[PDB]
Every structure is written in structure tokens, then in C-alpha cells.
Write a protein that binds this ligand. Structure first.
Ligand SMILES: *[C@@H]1O[C@H](CO)[C@@H](O[C@@H]2O[C@H](CO)[C@@H](O[C@@H]3O[C@H](CO)[C@@H](O)[C@H](O[C@H]4O[C@H](CO)[C@@H](O)[C@H](O)[C@@H]4O)[C@@H]3O)[C@H](O)[C@H]2NC(C)=O)[C@H](O)[C@H]1NC(C)=O
Ligand SMILES: *[C@@H]1O[C@H](CO)[C@@H](O[C@@H]2O[C@H](CO)[C@@H](O[C@@H]3O[C@H](CO)[C@@H](O)[C@H](O[C@H]4O[C@H](CO)[C@@H](O)[C@H](O)[C@@H]4O)[C@@H]3O)[C@H](O)[C@H]2NC(C)=O)[C@H](O)[C@H]1NC(C)=O
Ligand SMILES: CC(=O)N[C@H]1[C@H](O[C@@H]2[C@@H](O)[C@H](O)O[C@H](CO)[C@@H]2O)O[C@H](CO)[C@@H](O[C@@H]2O[C@H](CO)[C@H](O)[C@H](O)[C@H]2O)[C@@H]1O
Ligand SMILES: CC(=O)N[C@H]1[C@H](O[C@@H]2[C@@H](O)[C@H](O)O[C@H](CO)[C@@H]2O)O[C@H](CO)[C@@H](O[C@@H]2O[C@H](CO)[C@H](O)[C@H](O)[C@H]2O)[C@@H]1O
Ligand SMILES: O=c1ccn([C@@H]2O[C@H](COP(=O)(O)OP(=O)(O)O)[C@@H](O)[C@H]2O)c(=O)[nH]1
Ligand SMILES: O=c1ccn([C@@H]2O[C@H](COP(=O)(O)OP(=O)(O)O)[C@@H](O)[C@H]2O)c(=O)[nH]1
Ligand SMILES: *[C@@H]1O[C@H](CO)[C@@H](O)[C@H](O)[C@H]1NC(C)=O
Ligand SMILES: *[C@@H]1O[C@H](CO)[C@@H](O)[C@H](O)[C@H]1NC(C)=O
Ligand SMILES: *[C@@H]1O[C@H](CO)[C@@H](O)[C@H](O)[C@H]1NC(C)=O
Ligand SMILES: [Mg+2]
Ligand SMILES: [Mg+2]
Lengths: 313, 325
């Protein structure tokens, strides 16, 4: 009865246009109960659900010219200049130690004037030319379009970085202990590494029905429970799985919560992401508190540099 | 009954006028004369050790900013990383203009954000921004909360040196919405007498220092004793350029204070003046229920606090607000 569930079931029957239909899908105004009274973000989500063929405005095509051991992929918005630079100087440094290459990309969409964003296009061009780590696509960068940010990033992995051994995807305000991540990745068996997917995995979750939370999903949009999913603050997976995940995205309708969407894709593949206790996407309760952690949400740019500096000793 | 350290040093200054300005070595005396110095937070140690130093130089100047005599100079406190805040101001209420040959010009007021304070290095982008927009003033001191009174004194020096003929000054924060049209209408309503010593804002009377160690405005009893003079909250206040010159001259006679808007109130009190409350300055915001009605902003001078998109949104709706409301 909920809209997403019914359309997804239609998709299941077709695989057992929803991909490049980019006119407004006016059907939703008649088939979604109370559509006129939905918040604008749901109107936009429903009207443009069947469009995901957006193009790269800023690419870094040689980012993976040397096959990486680890790709860091960080969700960011144009105005977050200090967040990105703190990451570059702390846990997101690119490196080649042990010939285990780490490369870094930030994942951006457009911040257009119609959404009341200041025009930062000249600063973003300066930054992209200076640091060569900005990927930017021509879609409206919004909270409910983070699942678009996920799908287009996975597409970019498939086209431009398909041979990375591992992928870390996360937020631009989480602290990551990249040394611990690399140590963990190097201790993996070959079998465990082929389909690795770990994070702060949430089981038996359901959609928030509370209208004051940013995660609110109306009953007319989605019914039932969520699959197991790793919290989007940051998760870690094999590049092999990144390609299998990209292939399966066509068979899963976009969903307004992006980390739930990745969990939906894993489930369709027959996989279950595994919890690693070092991923603290809901923060901690002292620099020694951070020694054994993989990730902590959330930290400001100065805090990111401070923690990283103290951890090096 | 010995006063607190700031009061005692201010008493010494008062008697000297009825070095504290370019002594930039650490004043190790404070470790002996400030009660409990060793147990103070680092920000108080730094403030006390370097209290007598304020001859910092401009690294980035805009020397022709006031080549055309302004009617109103907008001076906005900002920090290096705040690119989106500054651009939103440029496009909304901080636009430069010449309507009615009443020139409005804009500067942002910055210090350094050094790597030793764990700041990411954004210096090349700031230099690019300055080259593009020609509205960055930057001095070579450590930009911190407790150095904002330094930001105030160095800005007033720049007005005396480089913009002394501006008719009015608005000084405010980079996270406030300002109804600049209402400000200009108000300034054009003033008698010549009221305008000569104009100083208005969200004026707080009978305030004292916060003694709760958990608040960012905390001030220890060993640092400052007694009450605060009347003062306009720093989110933004409005005053004459004539008074800006009088305020600059008097800064030499008032020791820096960790809270910048209290410092400005101290300087006004030394001038024999009392800032006046204007109800349109909402430095503690407006009612939660009226935040999404643009008519709520028509009669306001200033609202704290708003994000870059919110400032642009409010400004855009305000340009057609005369059609409703
Ligand atoms: C995720 O990103 C996608 C891609 O950027 C984004 O899709 C875009 O949404 C906007 C609406 O938010 C669409 O813009 C509309 O296009 C139609 C074309 O006919 C216009 O008629 C619409 O007019 C509206 O706005 C007018 C004023 O400008 C009003 O007068 C009028 O009444 C309408 O309200 C409107 O401009 C745009 O076409 C798509 N672009 C695509 C599909 O490529 C989507 O919104 C984002 N999703 C979320 C959840 O944020
Ligand atoms: C307001 O701005 C002023 C001007 O920027 C700023 O003054 C500066 O303060 C810093 C301290 O925070 C001073 O730097 C110190 O200088 C002394 C020598 O005079 C050094 O011994 C200090 O070394 C420290 O760090 C070393 C390495 O970690 C340690 O080994 C050592 O023990 C110290 O911890 C440090 O370099 C600087 O000299 C002044 N500059 C000037 C021009 O006065 C002031 O701090 C700001 N005030 C506030 C309240 O923020
Ligand atoms: C089972 C679970 O953990 N579900 C969500 C969790 O609900 C909490 C309840 O289990 C608990 O009893 O009460 C608290 C109230 O204090 C919570 O309601 O809440 C978290 C935080 O919202 C959810 O994780 C988040 O889910 C959203 C999507 O709704 C999104 O995926 C986000 O990234 C993730 O952090 C749990 O799913
Ligand atoms: C007289 C006054 O307003 N004093 C400060 C005010 O104190 C409030 C108390 O009067 C009341 O009993 O409790 C409330 C808390 O619910 C307040 O504590 O608090 C405001 C907010 O801090 C102060 O304004 C701020 O002062 C700091 C310096 O201390 C700084 O100048 C800042 O710009 C300003 O907004 C009142 O001074
Ligand atoms: O339109 C958006 C909104 C958010 N983000 C990024 O998504 C991540 C999560 O945002 P937020 O902190 O608001 O979400 P929460 O952690 O509260 O779920 C952050 O890295 C944001 O920079 C984004 O890229 N585009
Ligand atoms: O080290 C600093 C800290 C703050 N600010 C500016 O001072 C103003 C007030 O900052 P904040 O909002 O944190 O203070 P609050 O309103 O909470 O008293 C804003 O314009 C900041 O950009 C600054 O210039 N340097
Ligand atoms: C997606 O593809 C269709 C044609 O197949 C095209 O009309 C549409 O403009 C494309 N969408 C975008 C955003 O380019
Ligand atoms: C201020 O002046 C004194 C000498 O006049 C000098 O030693 C000191 O370094 C100056 N301070 C700064 C920050 O230039
Ligand atoms: C316009 O303003 C300037 C000061 O900014 C003044 O010198 C000039 O005389 C004015 N011109 C007119 C037309 O009054
Ligand atoms: Mg977050
Ligand atoms: Mg503020």
C-alpha cells in the first residue's frame, strides 16, 4: 500500500523507465494519498524518483591511475571547505606507504541559487584545481538526494576506479582512524576480504515516523521494516563488492535514506553487513578513548586535526 | 580588599591618564600577581600574558575602500573558514551600493587562524577570495574568542587611518541577518544632534560577568570583579563615524577585555556615553512561531542567528514583502 513498496515490487517483477525518466512523474499527485500536504522534499523525491542519469561536472579521471589499496570517498557540500581541508591534513591524507596506495575523493552535487545557496562556484573551482579530489555531479545536492550521491559514486567506481581493493565511504565530519583501518584490512583472510562490508550495523530498524526528525518517512511512502544496514557515518567494503553493489542499484528504487538504501542493495545481493564495534556513528560517552576506534561521529575541523595529531604519538 | 587583576590594572591606567600598548613579550608578572594563575584555563593565561600588546599589522588591507566617502560602513567579524557566511552576506544584506548617493561599503574583519591552533590551512583560498571581492581586512594576530576586543581596537584604528569620514558604522557578526534597508531608513530619520553620538543596539543593563565555568562567557572572580557597564550585544550595533573616532582615541585608556562587546561598552562609559536600546535588534532571536513569516523581519533591524541559506532566503522574500504584510 505504501508507494515505495508497491513500485519496488513492480521492479522485482520486471527483473525476475525508472532510470532515465526525468520529467516530473505527475502520476504521483493522484496515486499518493495526501500528496499535496507532503513536505516539499517528499514532493521532489516522488516526482523525480525515476531519474538518475546525471553527469559529472567535475571529474578526476586519473584518481585511480595507480590501482589503490584503499579509496576514501567522502560525502560533502560545496560550502564545507574547512571540513574537507581538515580531512586532507589529518586522516584523509593520500599515501603510498608499503606500496599500499590510499586515494581520496569528495562527493558533491550542485548547490544552486534556487535553494538559496551563496554562489561559491569560483572558490570550488580554485579548490578543485588545487587539490584534484573533487567529484561533482549535476544534481541538486540535498539530504534526500544522498541516495543519488551513493548511486552516482558507485557508478564512478565502476567506470573510473574499479580496481581499488577496498572502499571507505563516509561523512565529512567524522574522525577516522585510517591507520587502524589499514591494519585491519591487512589482517583479513582472502576469503573474508572478497565480500567485506562492515560498519555500525543496525538490525531490526524501522522508519522514523516522528515529523521533527530529519529521518521522517510517512506511512504512505514506506511501510514495514528496514534491512540490516551500516550507519552512513562511515563504512568499509571491498571494491569487488562495490562493483556488485553498483550493478544491483538498477533493481532497487532510490530511497530517501541513503544508508538504508545501501542496506537494501546488500540484501538483494544475498549479503548481510557485519558490525564492527570500532565504528561509533553515535559518538562515545581523553585521547586514549580514541586509540582503539575506527570512526567517531561527529567532529569539527579543528577537532579532527587535534585528535589526529595527538594519536600520532 | 584587593580588586581582581583586570580592575587593578585598569585603576593603574586611569591614574596614569588622570608600556600597556606595545609590550609583546610575555608579561611573566601575571604568574605571581593573578590569584590562581596556574589553575586558569589556557585562554585566560594567554589573555593575561599578552594583555599589553596591540600593535599588530595589517597583512591584507583594502586602502581605497573609502575613497568615496561612505554613508554607511558595514564591518563584519569573521574567521578564515567562514567562506559561505561571507559570500551570503555579499549577496544579501551586505551588498555595496550607492542608492541616493549614500554609499554603502563592506569589510570583513579577520585575524590569523594558525596551524598551531589546529586550523586547516585555508590561506591560499582566502587570498584568492580577497583578490576577487576586495573586502577582506586581515591582521597578524591569533584570531580567537578572547582576542575579539583586539579585533575591535584594530578595526577602530583602521577607521581612524583609512575610513575616518564614514557617516555611520554598523559592526556585527557573520551569522546575523541585518535589515540594511531598515537601517538606512532609520539613519536618514535622525536629527543632526541624535546622529552625532548615535550608538544603538540590544543594550543590556545591570549585567555582570558569568561565573559558571561551563559557559563560553565565563570570567573568573580573580580576573574581573564588579559589574559590567551598559553595553550593546556584539551580534551587531550601529553608531556614528564621529563616535567611531572618539571610541578609537579612548581605546588606549581601557585595557583589553576577554568579551569584546563589554569592552566597547567600557569605552563608551569612559566617554561619558550610554548606548541606547533599540527594540529592532534581536540578538537573542525572535519568537519560534514567527520565524517563517517574512512580515516578522520587515520591522526588525537585526536577528541572531541565521545560516548562509537562511540569510539569502530572508533577504529574497524581503524584497517583495511590501507586496504583502
Ligand atoms: C534531487 O536532484 C534532482 C536533480 O537536480 C532534483 O530534480 C530537479 O527538481 C527540480 C524541482 O525541485 C525540478 O525543477 C522543476 O522543473 C519543472 C520543469 O517543467 C518546472 O516546471 C518546475 O517549476 C517549479 O518552480 C517554478 C519556479 O521556478 C514554479 O513557478 C513552479 O510552480 C514549480 O514549482 C521546477 O523548476 C527539476 O526539473 C529537477 N531536475 C531534474 C529532474 O533533472 C530533485 O528535486 C532533487 N530531489 C530532492 C529530494 O531534493
Ligand atoms: C591574541 O593574539 C596574540 C597575537 O597573536 C597571541 O599572542 C601570541 O600568543 C602565543 C601563545 O599562545 C605566543 O606563542 C608563544 O611564545 C612563547 C615565547 O614568547 C613560546 O614559549 C610559546 O611556546 C609554546 O609552545 C611550545 C611548543 O609547543 C612549548 O614548548 C612552550 O612551552 C609553549 O607552550 C609560544 O610559541 C606568541 O608569542 C604570542 N605572539 C605575540 C605577538 O604576542 C595571543 O595568544 C592571543 N590571545 C588569546 C587570548 O587568544
Ligand atoms: C532499531 C534502531 O536502532 N532503530 C533506529 C534508532 O531507533 C532508536 C530506538 O531503537 C530506541 O529504542 O529509541 C531511540 C530514541 O532515543 C531511537 O528511536 O534510532 C537511530 C537514530 O535515528 C536509527 O539510526 C538512523 O536511522 C536513520 C534512518 O531512519 C538513518 O539511517 C541514520 O543514518 C541512522 O543513524 C535507527 O535505525
Ligand atoms: C543582565 C543580563 O542579561 N545578563 C546576561 C544574561 O544572564 C541571564 C540571567 O539574567 C538569567 O537569570 O538567566 C539567563 C539564563 O537562562 C541568563 O544567564 O545572559 C546573557 C546570555 O549570556 C548575557 O548576554 C551575553 O553576555 C556575554 C558576556 O557575559 C556577551 O556579552 C554576549 O554577547 C551577551 O549576549 C547577559 O549579559
Ligand atoms: O545535502 C546534503 C546534506 C548532507 N550531506 C553530507 O551528508 C553527511 C551527513 O549529514 P548530516 O550530518 O546533516 O546527517 P546526520 O549525521 O545527522 O544523519 C555530511 O557529511 C554532510 O556534509 C551532503 O553531502 N549533502
Ligand atoms: O575567534 C573568533 C570567534 C568568533 N568570531 C566571530 O565572532 C562572532 C560571534 O561568534 P559566535 O557566534 O561564536 O558567538 P556568540 O554569538 O555565541 O556569542 C561571529 O561573527 C564569529 O565569526 C571571530 O571573528 N573570531
Ligand atoms: C536522462 O536521459 C534522458 C534520455 O534518455 C534525457 O532526456 C534526460 O535529460 C537525461 N537526464 C539528465 C539529467 O541528463
Ligand atoms: C610592537 O612594538 C614593539 C616595539 O615598538 C615591538 O617590539 C613589538 O614586536 C611590536 N609588536 C608587534 C606584534 O609588531
Ligand atoms: C555624492 O557623494 C559624495 C560623497 O560620497 C560627495 O562628495 C558628492 O558631492 C555627492 N554628489 C552629489 C551629487 O551631491
Ligand atoms: Mg552527521
Ligand atoms: Mg553567534
Amino acid at each position: 500500500e505504501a508507494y515505495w513498496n508497491r513500485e519496488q515490487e513492480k521492479l522485482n517483477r520486471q527483473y525476475n523507465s525508472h532510470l532515465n525518466y526525468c520529467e516530473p512523474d505527475l502520476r504521483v499527485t493522484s496515486v499518493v494519498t495526501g500528496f499535496n500536504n507532503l513536505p516539499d522534499r517528499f514532493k521532489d523525491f516522488l516526482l523525480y524518483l525515476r531519474c538518475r542519469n546525471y553527469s559529472l561536472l567535475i571529474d578526476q579521471p586519473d584518481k585511480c591511475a595507480k590501482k589503490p589499496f584503499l579509496l576514501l570517498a567522502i560525502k560533502s557540500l560545496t560550502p564545507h571547505f574547512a571540513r574537507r581541508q581538515a580531512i586532507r591534513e589529518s586522516w584523509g591524507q593520500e599515501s603510498n606507504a608499503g606500496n599500499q596506495t590510499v586515494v581520496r575523493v569528495f562527493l558533491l552535487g550542485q548547490t544552486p541559487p534556487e535553494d538559496n545557496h551563496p554562489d561559491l562556484s569560483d572558490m570550488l573551482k580554485f579548490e578543485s584545481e588545487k587539490h584534484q579530489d573533487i567529484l561533482m555531479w549535476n544534481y541538486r545536492d540535498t539530504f534526500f538526494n544522498l541516495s543519488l550521491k551513493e548511486v552516482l559514486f558507485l557508478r564512478w567506481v565502476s567506470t573510473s576506479c574499479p580496481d581499488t581493493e577496498f572502499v571507505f565511504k563516509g561523512d565529512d565530519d567524522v574522525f577516522v582512524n585510517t591507520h587502524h583501518i589499514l591494519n585491519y584490512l591487512n589482517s583479513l583472510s582472502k576469503t573474508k576480504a572478497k565480500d567485506l562490508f562492515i560498519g555500525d550495523v543496525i538490525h531490526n530498524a524501522g522508519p522514523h515516523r516522528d515529523k521533527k526528525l530529519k529521518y521522517y518517512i510517512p506511512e504512505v511512502v514506506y511501510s514495514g521494516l528496514y534491512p540490516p544496514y551500516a550507519g552512513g557515518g562511515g563504512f568499509l567494503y571491498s571494491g569487488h563488492l562495490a562493483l556488485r553493489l553498483y550493478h544491483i542499484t538498477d533493481q532497487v528504487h532510490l530511497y530517501p535514506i541513503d544508508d538504508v538504501y545501501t542496506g537494501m542493495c546488500l540484501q538483494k545481493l544475498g549479503l548481510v553487513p557485519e558490525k564492527h564495534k570500532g565504528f561509533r556513528t553515535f559518538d562515545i560517552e581523553n585521547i586514549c578513548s580514541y586509540v582503539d576506534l575506527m570512526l567517531v561521529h561527529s567532529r569539527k575541523p579543528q577537532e579532527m586535526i587535534d585528535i589526529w595529531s595527538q594519536l600520532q604519538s
